[PDB]
Amino acid sequence: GAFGDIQSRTVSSSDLYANTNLVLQRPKAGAIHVPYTQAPSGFEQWKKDKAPSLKFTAPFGCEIYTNPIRAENCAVGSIPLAFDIPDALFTRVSETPT
Amino acid sequence: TTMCLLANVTFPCAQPPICYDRKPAETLAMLSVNVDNPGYDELLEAAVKC
Amino acid sequence: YKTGMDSPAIKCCGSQECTPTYRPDEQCKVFTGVYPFMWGGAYCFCDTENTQVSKAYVMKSDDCLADHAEAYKAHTASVQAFLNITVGEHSIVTTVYV
Amino acid sequence: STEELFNEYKLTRPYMARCIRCAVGSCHSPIAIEAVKSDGHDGYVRLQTSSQYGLDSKGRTMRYDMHGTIKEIPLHQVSLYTSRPCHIVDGHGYFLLARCPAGDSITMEFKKDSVRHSCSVPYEVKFNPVGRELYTHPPEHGVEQACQVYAHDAQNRGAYVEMHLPGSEVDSSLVSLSGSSVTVTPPDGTSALVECECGGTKISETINKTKQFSQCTKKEQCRAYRLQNDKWVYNSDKLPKAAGATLKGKLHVPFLLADGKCTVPLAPEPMITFGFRSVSLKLHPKNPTYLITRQLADEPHYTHELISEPAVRN
């Protein structure tokens, strides 16, 4: 009845775990059918509830994307920098205005 | 490559010996034993057409 | 999910048995005292001692490929910026790793 | 290359199954319904029925089973409806694709000369909007979100259903009385088999012969089955099965759920009133519209609200 009542290891795993509360029932007198009673799709019930995405709820104003799972532009922290500058770039004084 | 079965004759799955417009139930029996096959779609679309 | 169901095995004045297949959540049960009907009349002539076997199992849906949800685990992230550096009017645009 | 697609449902036949709601009561129907799937967005469902489509007994046809003899009608005689009428788009094999509104039932019906056939099933059909604005009928103009609808062609993809031997479909139009005995008349090009209980235990397989039997007085004691070695059926629970390993192949399913593009509406522009460290929002939703706010700090304090009335949010 909840998220993950089907658990396939990958998309093409061909070996899935399933716990879906399936119970067979007695057929009606005079009819050829297979009557069962199981809990509904937990994936559908997860989709009905679905507290909103991390795209709308993330702190610091992040921008969650998909194909690599990544966040963008989270305005937090600070980047330190190291500059190993060679001595050739230091122009002398009198070659610049003053 | 993948070899399909009707007997102990491992024929190529793109080249079946029978087709449905010739035989009604022998093609269905050839498809019956070869369900567990990764080249079953090749055997399928070859086993229709002559 | 997609509850798959095998056709009911019916024997007239007999007794079936349960032969399992180890399909996911594969329930099986044998029902006695069954007088089934087809479209062309009744199926057995025996009143009692007939037997119908119900067999159900859970397989995943046909639209599993384009409609599925990936459960992951994440830890120890990696920050990576697209800087645009200019040092002494010499500009580069390089993906720096931080 | 449609003939390469249709060639696998040539191996199959339509059948009859038990429908719980028919035109009068509970019957055995040629248009019985196995499953309804409604998970595409803009109103497209995919019925798996007990009839076949796109084949003759031809372009737009339903092929069904009428007490053994396979019949056919054009597709524009078949209509189905959930709450409002649905619109049939195409068919391929045992599967039909319709554009349906939301409803708690499906009812398919066609009309022959003076016999009306119907099959109502208690299968819920839902309508799934795209985006953060919850419409009920897809709009006329807006923007285009990506979506997932059931594709309209019958292209072979990686999803299958499982086909099997049809079992012994019993009949009683075969068995008849003589003046003093019991007479079984199997049809031409078709072998029947007969089980009786008038002597001890009696059983026979007969072929192409009006074959009487002595010592049987009443034809209530003899059941005349019917046999078709060719012509697959679906693995239905409304059919009985054969004897021994049962399996003959698998077929692909048409109209799978593919990625697409869908047009979604665009809500009227909010009227924003600004103040010192505050923002007021006048909102006039045309149809119910999610407002989602969050702050750009370490505590976001996100607010999520379905708004369906003219409302002012500060």
Side-chain angles (χ1 to χ4, degrees), chain A residues 90-98:
Chain A
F90 289 102
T91 308
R92 297 177 65 88
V93 172
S94 63
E95 292 183 352
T96 57
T98 299

Side-chain angles (χ1 to χ4, degrees), chain C residues 6-8 39-40 43-44 66, chain D residues 67 148 172 223 225 236 239 241:
Chain C
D6 195 1
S7 295
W39 57 266
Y43 192 79
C44 295
Chain D
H67 298 286
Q148 289 178 356
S172 179
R223 301 288 186 266
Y225 298 94
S236 175
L239 299 171
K241 64 184 289 185

Side-chain angles (χ1 to χ4, degrees), chain A residues 8 11 20 26 33 38-40, chain C residues 1 3 25 31 33 52 58 60:
Chain A
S8 179
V11 188
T20 65
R26 190 177 188 272
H33 58 85
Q38 61 180 349
Chain C
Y1 54 80
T3 298
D25 201 359
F31 298 105
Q52 174 177 354
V58 176
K60 58 187 181 181

Side-chain angles (χ1 to χ4, degrees), chain B:
Chain B
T1 59
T2 303
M3 300 297 172
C4 291
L5 294 175
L6 194 149
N8 55 4
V9 179
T10 64
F11 63 98
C13 296
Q15 294 177 355
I18 52 178
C19 295
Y20 179 71
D21 55 357
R22 295 185 185 274
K23 299 293 179 67
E26 293 181 353
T27 66
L28 307 181
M30 184 184 73
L31 294 173
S32 303
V33 72
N34 294 317
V35 175
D36 295 331
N37 194 1
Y40 178 73
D41 197 3
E42 295 181 354
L43 176 63
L44 179 144
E45 290 180 353
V48 173
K49 292 181 71 173
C50 180

Side-chain angles (χ1 to χ4, degrees), chain D residues 11 29 35 88 101 116 130 133 151 162 180 196-197 205 225 231 246 284-285 296 300 310:
Chain D
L11 310 180
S29 179
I88 297 172
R116 181 177 177 177
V130 182
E133 303 179 7
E162 187 176 358
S180 65
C196 296
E197 204 264 330
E205 295 181 355
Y225 298 94
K231 292 294 183 181
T246 318
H284 305 288
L296 306 181

Side-chain angles (χ1 to χ4, degrees), chain D:
Chain D
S1 177
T2 63
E3 189 177 2
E4 187 181 0
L5 271 59
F6 280 106
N7 62 8
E8 285 292 324
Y9 294 99
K10 293 181 180 181
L11 310 180
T12 59
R13 68 181 183 91
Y15 61 95
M16 300 183 78
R18 179 181 181 271
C19 188
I20 188 168
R21 300 290 293 271
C22 298
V24 171
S26 177
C27 74
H28 299 281
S29 179
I31 52 168
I33 299 163
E34 304 292 325
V36 177
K37 300 294 182 182
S38 65
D39 290 325
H41 281 100
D42 281 330
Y44 298 98
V45 306
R46 184 186 72 198
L47 284 80
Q48 181 177 5
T49 65
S50 173
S51 298
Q52 287 177 356
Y53 303 97
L55 281 74
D56 63 355
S57 178
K58 200 186 289 186
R60 279 76 157 173
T61 53
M62 183 180 74
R63 174 173 72 183
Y64 66 96
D65 190 5
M66 200 65 209
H67 298 286
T69 64
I70 288 172
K71 293 181 181 181
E72 62 176 358
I73 56 172
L75 186 60
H76 71 278
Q77 299 301 108
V78 175
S79 67
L80 88 167
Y81 64 94
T82 61
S83 300
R84 295 173 180 87
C86 295
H87 297 97
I88 297 172
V89 178
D90 202 359
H92 182 81
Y94 289 109
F95 292 90
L96 192 152
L97 185 74
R99 183 178 69 191
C100 278
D104 51 351
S105 69
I106 271 287
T107 297
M108 179 185 283
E109 63 184 5
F110 71 97
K111 188 176 72 175
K112 189 52 74 173
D113 298 332
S114 294
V115 177
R116 181 177 177 177
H117 294 277
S118 295
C119 184
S120 299
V121 289
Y123 288 160
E124 181 173 357
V125 174
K126 64 177 183 174
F127 185 81
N128 297 112
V130 182
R132 277 91 68 191
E133 303 179 7
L134 299 179
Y135 54 88
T136 310
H137 191 272
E140 296 181 351
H141 54 277
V143 291
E144 238 114 47
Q145 302 294 323
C147 60
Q148 289 178 356
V149 295
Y150 294 114
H152 284 84
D153 57 353
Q155 182 182 0
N156 200 156
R157 301 183 189 184
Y160 293 101
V161 289
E162 187 176 358
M163 300 295 167
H164 285 274
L165 278 169
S168 297
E169 291 182 353
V170 73
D171 195 353
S172 179
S173 296
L174 302 180
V175 58
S176 65
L177 287 173
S178 176
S180 65
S181 295
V182 175
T183 298
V184 175
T185 63
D188 48 355
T190 299
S191 177
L193 75 154
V194 175
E195 296 185 355
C196 296
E197 204 264 330
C198 68
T201 300
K202 188 261 182 294
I203 183 168
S204 294
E205 295 181 355
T206 179
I207 293 170
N208 202 0
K209 289 181 183 180
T210 301
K211 184 174 181 180
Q212 294 182 357
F213 300 111
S214 65
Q215 293 294 321
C216 287
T217 300
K218 292 182 179 181
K219 65 181 182 179
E220 295 179 353
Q221 297 296 323
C222 292
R223 301 288 186 266
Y225 298 94
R226 287 174 64 177
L227 295 174
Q228 289 182 357
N229 53 7
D230 54 353
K231 292 294 183 181
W232 295 351
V233 299
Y234 175 74
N235 193 1
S236 175
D237 53 348
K238 269 81 70 176
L239 299 171
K241 64 184 289 185
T246 318
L247 181 56
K248 295 176 86 175
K250 67 182 181 181
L251 302 183
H252 75 92
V253 294
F255 321 115
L256 286 184
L257 193 67
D259 289 332
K261 295 293 184 182
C262 289
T263 184
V264 300
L266 188 62
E269 185 177 1
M271 289 181 285
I272 307 168
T273 302
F274 299 112
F276 171 66
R277 288 169 68 91
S278 181
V279 164
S280 177
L281 290 177
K282 284 180 68 180
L283 267 52
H284 305 288
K286 182 177 181 292
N287 48 5
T289 306
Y290 283 102
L291 175 66
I292 301 168
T293 69
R294 59 101 176 261
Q295 286 181 352
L296 306 181
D298 54 352
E299 287 179 352
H301 290 289
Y302 73 99
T303 302
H304 181 77
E305 184 181 0
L306 179 67
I307 293 165
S308 63
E309 293 175 354
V312 180
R313 293 291 181 270
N314 298 326

Side-chain angles (χ1 to χ4, degrees), chain C residues 21 33 46-47 82 98:
Chain C
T21 315
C46 301
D47 288 329
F82 292 174
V98 285

